[PDB]
Amino acid sequence: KIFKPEELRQALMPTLEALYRQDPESLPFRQPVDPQLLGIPDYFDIVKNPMDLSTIKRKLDTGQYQEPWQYVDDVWLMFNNAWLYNRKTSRVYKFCSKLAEVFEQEIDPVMQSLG
Numbered sequence: 001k002i003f004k005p006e007e008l009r010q011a012l013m014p015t016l017e018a019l020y021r022q023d024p025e026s027l028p029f030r031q032p033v034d035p036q037l038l039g040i041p042d043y044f045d046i047v048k049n050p051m052d053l054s055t056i057k058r059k060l061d062t063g064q065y066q067e068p069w070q071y072v073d074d075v076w077l078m079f080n081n082a083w084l085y086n087r088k089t090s091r092v093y094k095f096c097s098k099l100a101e102v103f104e105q106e107i108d109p110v111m112q113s114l115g
């Protein structure tokens with residue numbers, strides 16, 4: 001089973017758009033982490049493989065995933081990074097949890113269709 005880039009975009013982009021549509025919860029995740037602007041100078045001591053919504057969107061837009069699981073792995077990498085770095089009481093951690101709840105609901109039927 002070979003997945004063409006347009007077929008992956010058609011199936012998976014709606015699940016990424018669902019996360020962008022969470023406002024304000026997607027705001028911390030819409031651009032690559034910049035620790036100087038965000039005031040978190042130790043970030044890359046903790047997080048070695050950063051990921052954000054715009055990077056995932058570019059990969060889908062340009063055909064960089066060969067298989068649906070690679071896209072799923074990048075979304076969970078984004079979430080796991082934020083749960084790793086942020087305190088459980090923090091706004092970013094709580095926003096991360098809301099996006100993960102949305103993602104689980106949207107991705108389940110789509111992965112069933114691609115499986």
Ligand SMILES: C[C@@H]1CC(=O)Nc2cc3cc(c2N1)CCCCCN1CCCc2ccc(cc21)OCCCNC3=O
Binds near residue numbers: 039082086
């Ligand atoms: C996902 C990415 C990296 C991560 O994992 N955690 C952190 C930790 C932090 C921030 C983010 C993230 N988001 C990004 C947050 C969105 C708002 C940015 N901005 C725009 C609106 C006003 C304001 C005030 C204080 C501030 C950022 C901002 O920052 C204060 C210092 C501590 N700053 C974090 O504690």
